[PDB]
Amino acid sequence: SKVYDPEQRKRMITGPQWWARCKQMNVLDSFINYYDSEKHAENAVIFLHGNATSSYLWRHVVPHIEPVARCIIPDLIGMGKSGKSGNGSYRLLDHYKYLTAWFELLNLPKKIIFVGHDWGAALAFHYAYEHQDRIKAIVHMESVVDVIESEWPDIEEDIALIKSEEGEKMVLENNFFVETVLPSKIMRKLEPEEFAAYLEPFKEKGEVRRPTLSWPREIPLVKGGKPDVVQIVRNYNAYLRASDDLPKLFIESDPGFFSNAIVEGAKKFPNTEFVKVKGLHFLQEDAPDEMGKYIKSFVERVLKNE
């Protein structure tokens, strides 16, 4: 039985409070909502959320890192308070189209530090693969580290379901990932206002919820997965396994949820330091300060050493 953190309300940041601190910038035919700490712009730490979430995920993590480097946290296209995609498509490369276009307008330094979770990590990894000169370090967690060739025995049957018209009902009609999966993968009970911040972009039924269905349908299952995403992930996985000069931090979840394959995948990338914090999947909600402190020390060490 999950309980409220009795000390959390004293520092709670509501959706409105977070969004008030964000900025918007026109990108291609749409716009990106994002948080930008601005100061210390000689470095840039870009935090990338994944499915069901938004920049809001990082709200308690980022304060620890701001004093050492400019921190920048977007809402991916179609998610959070960002604009929608011009053609209503939300595949990995649609997200990547807007993300990379957005980067071009941020006055970034030559080498960028990424912090990625879930599909946000996939975006960071793909960016790194295509810009191998532009990466100072990578922090990742609960990340799409590799393809799936084989904890989740019926994964194929589940992905087959999510790819059927039942997936449309599960998500567009019934908001499966936001309203059911998200709270199940946080160890504490979220304050009502915190859950409301996650629900808000997806509060209405129908097509607005598309990004939360499109993400799982991108799953790089070797057997049945979209072959283009499978190849993207094979490509960046090979590159990461050879990236000895790229400092990395893997933040492992304890106990995690079916996370053994992620950890083993992560251990195939050289120059990775491993740390562990409490959580299931959305570990930012269970150990944000331990995460922030780990990320801060890592960044500091990377900037020294360099």
Ligand SMILES: O=C(Cc1ccc(O)cc1)Nc1ncc(-c2ccc(O)cc2)nc1Cc1ccccc1
């Ligand atoms: O729990 C299930 C089984 C299931 C539940 C509801 C339903 O309508 C159909 C099947 N599957 C599952 N099993 C594990 C996880 C999961 C794994 C890792 C993680 O970090 C978070 C969730 N998520 C899920 C949910 C899911 C994902 C993708 C496609 C269909 C259903």
